[PDB]
Amino acid sequence: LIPPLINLLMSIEPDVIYAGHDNTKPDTSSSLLTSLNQLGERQLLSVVKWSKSLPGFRNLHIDDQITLIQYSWMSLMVFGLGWRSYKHVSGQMLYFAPDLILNEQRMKESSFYSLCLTMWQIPQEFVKLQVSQEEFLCMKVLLLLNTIPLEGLRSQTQFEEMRSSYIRELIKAIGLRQKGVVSSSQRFYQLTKLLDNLHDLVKQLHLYCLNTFIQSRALSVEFPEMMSEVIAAQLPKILAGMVKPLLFHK
Ligand SMILES: CC#C[C@]1(O)CC[C@H]2[C@@H]3CCC4=CC(=O)CCC4=C3[C@@H](c3ccc(N(C)C)cc3)C[C@@]21C
Numbered sequence: 001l002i003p004p005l006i007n008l009l010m011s012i013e014p015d016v017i018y019a020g021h022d023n024t025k026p027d028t029s030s031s032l033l034t035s036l037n038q039l040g041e042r043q044l045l046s047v048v049k050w051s052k053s054l055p056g057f058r059n060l061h062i063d064d065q066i067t068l069i070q071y072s073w074m075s076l077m078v079f080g081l082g083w084r085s086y087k088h089v090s091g092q093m094l095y096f097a098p099d100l101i102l103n104e105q106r107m108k109e110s111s112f113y114s115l116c117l118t119m120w121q122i123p124q125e126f127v128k129l130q131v132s133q134e135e136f137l138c139m140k141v142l143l144l145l146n147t148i149p150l151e152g153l154r155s156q157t158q159f160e161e162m163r164s165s166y167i168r169e170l171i172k173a174i175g176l177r178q179k180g181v182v183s184s185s186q187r188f189y190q191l192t193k194l195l196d197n198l199h200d201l202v203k204q205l206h207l208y209c210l211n212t213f214i215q216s217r218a219l220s221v222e223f224p225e226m227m228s229e230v231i232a233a234q235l236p237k238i239l240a241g242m243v244k245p246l247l248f249h250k
Pocket of ligand 1: 033036037038039040041043044073074077078080081096097112115205206208209210212224226227228230
């Protein structure tokens with residue numbers, strides 16, 4: 001049977017979130033980017049709500065909670081994007097939302113095709129590894145807990161304990177299907193290596209995002225309130241490498 005913490009994690013998953021995109025008009029660079037920003041805002045609010053229900057998180061200092069959300073939102077959103085694409089469209093479209101689905105042809109006409117291909121890697125890897133929902137749910141918590149300040153957190157002890165607890169839960173999630181010590185240990189390496197590899201992909205997304213933000217007036221792209229502050233609050237520092245990415249492997 002499924003371990004209770006994994007069961008809890010499934011129960012607190014956000015519901016389906018819509019972009020509010022107007023699909024009756026043809027795509028433009030500005031319209032797509034704006035819908036993506038609107039969806040991002042909605043997904044951020046959803047991440048905040050999720051975090052409030054996430055066992056352990058509310059007991060970290062409030063400053064730490066804010067920092068970890070500010071550090072991890074891009075990772076959580078692209079990982080989510082990968083999951084939805086894998087589950088709803090067999091990994092073969094980018095499933096941003098039910099009203100914002102980009103098949104490859106739409107990607108090619110997006111104006112940011114290379115960015116789409118970079119993002120599209122994640123669901124193709126989920127297809128390759130056949131990631132289970134239980135593994136996904138645990139890995140997603142670890143992404144929230146995958147970067148800390150250079151000086152550490154205020155609730156560092158509690159953070160280490162919480163992070164270690166979700167790593168132990170990932171190991172149980174793996175043990176649900178992959179039986180055999182060799183397979184299970186290899187599976188842990190592969191899934192944790194995937195999380196390590198996400199740091200680099202996410203850096204490309206952070207740069208694109210920051211450039212788009214700076215040039216938002218010229219490009220006629222709107223950035224909502226919570227998006228503007230999470231970017232204001234940490235993106236340059238993160239891009240500069242003035243934080244500590246946590247790696248599972250050297
Ligand atoms: C085209 C394009 C583009 C981007 O600027 C770069 C990565 C995109 C990100 C991917 C991963 C991603 C997955 C989603 O499901 C929603 C949106 C999303 C984005 C976009 C985004 C926009 C604003 C925010 N805020 C308000 C915090 C969050 C995410 C658009 C992003 C950043």
